[PDB]
A paper describes a structure:
Can f 1 and Fel d 7 have a typical lipocalin fold consisting of central eight anti-parallel beta strands, a flanking 310, and an α-helix close to the C-termini. The most disordered regions for both structures are the N- and C-termini. Both Can f 1 and Fel d 7 have an open positively charged calyx at the center of an anti-parallel beta-barrel.
Fel d 7 from cats is the most closely related lipocalin and is 63% identical to Can f 1 while the rest of the lipocalins are only 13%–25% identical indicating that these two proteins are from a distinct evolutionary lineage from the other lipocalin allergens. However, the prevalence of IgE antibodies to Fel d 7 is only 38%–46% in cat allergic patients, suggesting that Can f 1 may be the primary sensitizer. While Can f 1 shows electron densities for most loops flanking beta-strands, some Fel d 7 loop regions are disordered: Arg44-Trp48, Glu122-Gln127, and Asn158-Glu160. While the calyx of Can f 1 is somewhat larger than that of Fel d 7, both have significantly more interior surface area and volume than other dog lipocalins such as Can f 2 (15), Can f 4 (16), and Can f 6 (17). Subsequent molecular dynamics simulations for 3 microseconds showed that the carboxylate of the ligands samples between the two positively charged residues (R101 and K131 for Can f 1; R102 and K132 for Fel d 7). Indeed, simulations with 2 oleate molecules confirmed that 2 oleates could remain bound for up to 3 μs to Can f 1, however 2 oleate molecules only stayed briefly bound to Fel d 7. For both Can f 1 and Fel d 7, approximately a 2:1 ratio of oleate to protein was measured.
Numbering used by the authors: 27 to 44, 49 to 122, 127 to 170
The structure:
Amino acid sequence: DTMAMSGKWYLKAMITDRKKPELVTPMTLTVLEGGNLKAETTLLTNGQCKEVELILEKTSEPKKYTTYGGKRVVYIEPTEVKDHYIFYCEGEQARMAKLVGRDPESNEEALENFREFLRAKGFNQEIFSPKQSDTC
Ligand SMILES: [Zn+2]
Ligand SMILES: [Zn+2]
Ligand SMILES: [Zn+2]
């Protein structure tokens, strides 16, 4: 269900096919009317705390959303552990994959699923793990 995804999450691993954050805060997902989602997080890049607020608009395809006014498409895929999910972002023109989990602790089996996902989508395996912090 959509409501299940609401609440706090941690950005645990990132990769791009083609601005590495030196620090990331937890991510909050809020379920808006109509099944749409709001994603809020803060990132420290170049010594500056930059807030990031995204609206993911539900589409006719489940687990598929659009953001930046249709400029980007975002897919949300589960893993074998109930509290970790894969976000796959594509559009304007780069690709990005993120592992998100409900806790910030290292998780081997979610990481194994993430690497398998990266292989199926043709990313490399040079994964980046941002440093975690409650406040920016
Ligand atoms: Zn957990
Ligand atoms: Zn495994
Ligand atoms: Zn294992």
